[PDB]
Design a protein around this ligand. Sequence first.
Ligand SMILES: N[C@@H](CCC(=O)O)C(=O)O
Ligand SMILES: N[C@@H](CCC(=O)O)C(=O)O
Lengths: 464, 461
Amino acid sequence: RREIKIEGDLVLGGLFPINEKGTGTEECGRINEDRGIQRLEAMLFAIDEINKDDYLLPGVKLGVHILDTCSRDTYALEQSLEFVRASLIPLLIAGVIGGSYSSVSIQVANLLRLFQIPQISYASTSAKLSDKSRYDYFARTVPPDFYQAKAMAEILRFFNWTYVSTVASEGDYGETGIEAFEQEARLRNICIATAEKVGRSNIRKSYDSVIRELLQKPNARVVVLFMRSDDSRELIAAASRANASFTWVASDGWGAQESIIKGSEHVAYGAITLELASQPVRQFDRYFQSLNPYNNHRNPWFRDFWEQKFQCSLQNKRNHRRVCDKHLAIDSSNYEQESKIMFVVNAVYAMAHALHKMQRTLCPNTTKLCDAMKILDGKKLYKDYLLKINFTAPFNPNKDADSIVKFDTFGDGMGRYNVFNFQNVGGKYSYLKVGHWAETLSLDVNSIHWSRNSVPTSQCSDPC
Amino acid sequence: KKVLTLEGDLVLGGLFPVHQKGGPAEDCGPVNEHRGIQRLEAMLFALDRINRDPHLLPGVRLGAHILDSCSKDTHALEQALDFVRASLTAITGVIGGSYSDVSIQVANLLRLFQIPQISYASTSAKLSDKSRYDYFARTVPPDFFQAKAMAEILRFFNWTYVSTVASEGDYGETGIEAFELEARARNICVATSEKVGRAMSRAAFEGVVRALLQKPSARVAVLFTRSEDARELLAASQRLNASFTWVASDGWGALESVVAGSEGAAEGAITIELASYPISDFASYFQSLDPWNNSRNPWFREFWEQRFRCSFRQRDCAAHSLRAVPFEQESKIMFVVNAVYAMAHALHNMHRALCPNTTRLCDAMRPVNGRRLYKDFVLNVKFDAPFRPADTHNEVRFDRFGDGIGRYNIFTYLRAGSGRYRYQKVGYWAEGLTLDTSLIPWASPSAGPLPASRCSEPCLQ
Ligand SMILES: N[C@@H](CCC(=O)O)C(=O)O
Ligand SMILES: N[C@@H](CCC(=O)O)C(=O)O
């Protein structure tokens, strides 16, 4: 296995979904180009920025203990044992800035709550979390799935889609989200045509029974997806194979990423997805576009990533593929910033300020490491400082209410979303924003490209 | 908190719900007199018998490290840290886990440290996945057969329109899923699906009862609930004066605390328990127990104060004996004993397969590894049951996923002998439904029409 073990006075661990589930060694195969390396480099850039500046955490240097979660909760639990090994090269971790999947975050929080280690997530949106009775050391920077369910129910009601079908992914993310969506639909007089639960368990659908059942009922052409990025890609590939076209109202799992839609653009011409409200970070783009496989030695996976993004394998020597050694680097022509980078950078600074206001209180006499801070109890770090943190966005020139980084009474974030429609402009398929959602709906119907160039309808019976 | 520990060459773990689930303020309060104390005493009695047995580990003495989870997964996870802090006097195996949610977290924690665990009452369909829970065995059948049995019972009585309520967790949701999948093939239809949260108040229970009462076509109610949740639902139904035909699972079983104070709301209720037989020696061992000599059980005193409503500071229960009070044995007792034996013979064959020198603990077996033990001696073990009654035909074996034979019994709560309100067995279930309607009071043709629940009654032909 590979990991980053940069040392420092204070170590902020993290867990990232660098590798995809399965597809080799029965554990994890291919590398997530978008959700596995961009967030990792964003966290590294944030750590470097905190260390290089003097305004935030002077003197004290921040190190990382980043680990790879192979898109599995069991693998994440196995890897997280090293974070609590010291309290059970033993390193004392003051915080785990990690957790991208709901199941992975839940397992990591359950393991960490015994050792009193605060944890901050950046992409895990679930209603099972934020329950302080069972998760008392969890505080994410993203809103739960309740707001997503409300927004998607409002979207369905806006277009008068009543007879809709629902497809969910088994686990701690799809199940709770689809339950909340069912409750919201029942509230808004919306009846679910059918309910499916895609999973990899012993008794589960084989990615074709769901599509066969969907085609069995042609009266409901709207499918609401609560699925992760690992299962949505395979489901859309199976749909493309079966040549079954439906309009897609997807959750944050699909997002606004083009990795899922690769070779299956036709099957998902009409797709509406919800993404967290994120603005691009220019500094992160500048840092990432200057990365090379020769000057980046602290990222073990990056070299392998260099063999996957550019389709140029055999970086040293082999007959598998041509050696694209030089004359080709990461540029804006093929690199797009992830829609959650500011959610992970703010996930780091949230602890940094928590480590900045604490050292200013326990031992304010010296602006450095002190003997009184030898032991870092998680209760004081989380409840006293981290819970009531309040700071502006580190890399946002604008200073407004939407650019503040503060938690809630349950350790959550602002419930603002954006709606992306998959449109084909000039022969190019891409996601375009067609509205937003901040306790209201602002869809732009006049600028929406549908699957059949017409507004779809989904009613149980034709009005008579 | 209090930890029950013994001394021996090999120490066996334990995890029992001695106390009941507490409120928002306290952690966990009242002691469980049937599912927390009787099972613990059964495990202790089995360990004593194994230690006294000459043919079973004549030189190796089995210890005990019984803990208390008190029906909380977080508390169970906090307590189970002692099972792994020794190794990081080590724990050989963990005989514990009475709830699916309680056992799943413990299994996940123990899989990292390669510590085998054999449960005694965990009945969940998601615990059979060997890819996620590598080191976990069970003596009781999963819910895969219980859901089928309840579907068969529902189909036998010509019930079509039913309502389902389940507890939020890894035992109720999986039960609803399996029941729905096995009912889709049949003509069973579910009207509404209701969920009971872990922290649920009386107002929410009343709201759930009202939601069930909103649709009057459905007369029955399928139950996947724990003891406390089922008791609270029955109490709410009694408060609202609502009568149903409850179809429950092993969570209710044949307990008397669920029907304590709510006998009116629970009339003619069909429940399913696991196939079991009383243990002759365990009854005598439990009845011959006193709070003074039995100083090895820290919770026993807490049980005694709850058994006859006394107080040791007030000098009460000085002449109270458990022998006089009638004894009701828990259905899932023998399984617990079997679980202990599931780690006894597994530690007996291995000692005869890796260290064939002496009968004591040799220096080569000091670091007992759970990997080889579970893969070669625990998963494939066959032996005669310890305390078989008469000369029946039963065997203790583990399947490919560490399961048991799916045999169930059907009980009905009926009032006989001037309202005794007792459970009566009206058949069993091994491979097909073979219940008898003669013993059921409301199923008799002379008693009255059979309770029916259909979405639409058959109109004129
Ligand atoms: N946000 C999804 C996971 C996908 C991701 O954003 O990385 C969740 O709630 O688990
Ligand atoms: N089998 C039920 C409860 C068993 C019992 O403790 O009686 C469960 O898995 O939660």
